[PDB]
């Protein structure tokens, strides 16, 4: 395990989560933290000076204990690990850059992009925005096996570069649900309001379990075949906001360390599909990533000159939970214009 990378990426996940819920407190949340971390790490490869340090600190790296080169190597090793072949679980993460043909790129940037982030450089004619949009969306659709289809909604005709990350995940439960045991049941939006959903069930299950009485919530870990699992956190009625305010790397570690095996008589879990798309601009600024969007942007590591600036970071994610397993995908795009 890369302890340093995992600590930054987990801090970043929960910091991003809190900002998303602050922005839209009544909405479903679904996103891929590791997709966004990797896309922004990829962006920082070309960043200099305050633009660079804001990105790395915004990603929750402690720059007094790590360096940019170590960070990029850590992401290189992460991508290699995630993309290793598996017979049990489908997992893929890719990066790409779409560049205007006439834009002069530093040889060291394109070489580092391929070497560290696995990224090719696709010559893209952004002035034909419809075709450029279709190319990027097709790349993402191919990478997510059809799941993420419209990551790019609008694309400025004067765009110079788009960095893209995608993640694709499909896994079977170690203990799958029997669809004969799925029945329409209430899902309570509030104490007085509910919707009817297909409620899946498992019976006589022994799984890791922890009742967090101080935080008024119950935590269980369900397993996928392969090296992935899922922490489910079930706050008691009306306590979701109280649990969310305690979300952190420390809490997750404590939950992990507190789990004990327990025989569960019945476990009820909805079958559901949810998706969200995000404009991350305001969230990234709240996290301190500011200069990359301004006239003072320093992306001179891409071109040799301070002639590029981020216009928009977007993210889209989908989560499907059903009797056989889970399918989830997400993609992140960093749109970049002239400066």
């Amino acid at each position: 395990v890369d302890r340093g990378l995992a600590s930054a990426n987990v801090d970043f996940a929960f910091s991003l989560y809190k900002q998303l819920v602050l922005k839209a407190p009544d909405k479903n949340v679904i996103f891929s933290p590791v997709s966004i971390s990797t896309a922004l790490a990829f962006l920082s490869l070309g960043a200099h000076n305050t633009t660079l340090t804001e990105i790395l600190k915004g990603l929750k790296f402690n720059l007094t204990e790590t360096s940019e080169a170590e960070i990029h190597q850590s992401f290189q090793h992460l991508l290699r690990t995630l993309n290793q072949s598996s017979d049990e679980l489908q997992l893929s993460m890719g990066n790409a850059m779409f560049v205007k043909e006439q834009l002069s790129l530093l040889d060291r940037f394109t070489e580092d992009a391929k070497r560290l982030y696995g990224s090719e450089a696709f010559a893209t004619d952004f002035q034909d925005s419809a075709a450029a949009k279709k190319l990027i969306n097709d790349y993402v659709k191919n990478g997510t096996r059809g799941k993420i289809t419209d990551l790019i909604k609008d694309l400025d005709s004067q765009t110079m570069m788009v960095l893209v990350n995608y993640i694709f995940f499909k896994a079977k439960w170690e203990m799958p649900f029997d669809p004969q045991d799925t029945h329409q049941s209430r899902f309570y939006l509030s104490k007085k309001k509910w919707v009817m959903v297909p409620m899946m069930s498992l019976h006589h299950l022994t799984i890791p379990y922890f009742r967090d009485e101080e935080l008024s919530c119950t935590v269980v870990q369900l397993n996928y075949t392969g090296n992935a699992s899922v922490f489910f956190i079930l706050p008691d009625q009306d306590k979701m906001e109280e649990v969310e305010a305690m979300l952190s790397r420390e809490t997750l570690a404590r939950w992990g360390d507190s789990l004990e095996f327990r025989e569960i008589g019945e476990l009820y879990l909805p079958k559901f599909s949810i998706s969200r798309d995000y404009n991350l601009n305001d969230i990234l600024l709240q996290l301190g990533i500011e200069e990359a969007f301004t006239s003072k942007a320093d992306l001179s590591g891409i071109t040799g000159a301070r002639n590029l600036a981020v216009s928009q970071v977007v993210h889209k994610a989908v989560l499907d939970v059903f009797e056989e397993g889970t399918e989830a995908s997400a993609a992140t795009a960093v749109k970049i214009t002239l400066l």
């Binding site: 679904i30 959903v197 979701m240």
Partner: protein, 34 residues
């Protein structure tokens, strides 16, 4: 004699054993939400 019933908002955190990556993080406030 223990029942765990996800019939109200809950969180889902999909994690990798190898890297400790959080692949996906989710709050399900409404499975049938627009």
């Amino acid at each position: 004699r223990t029942i765990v019933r996800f019939n109200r908002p809950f969180l889902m955190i999909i994690v990798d054993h190898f890297t400790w990556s959080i692949f996906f993080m989710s709050k399900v406030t409404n499975p049938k939400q627009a």
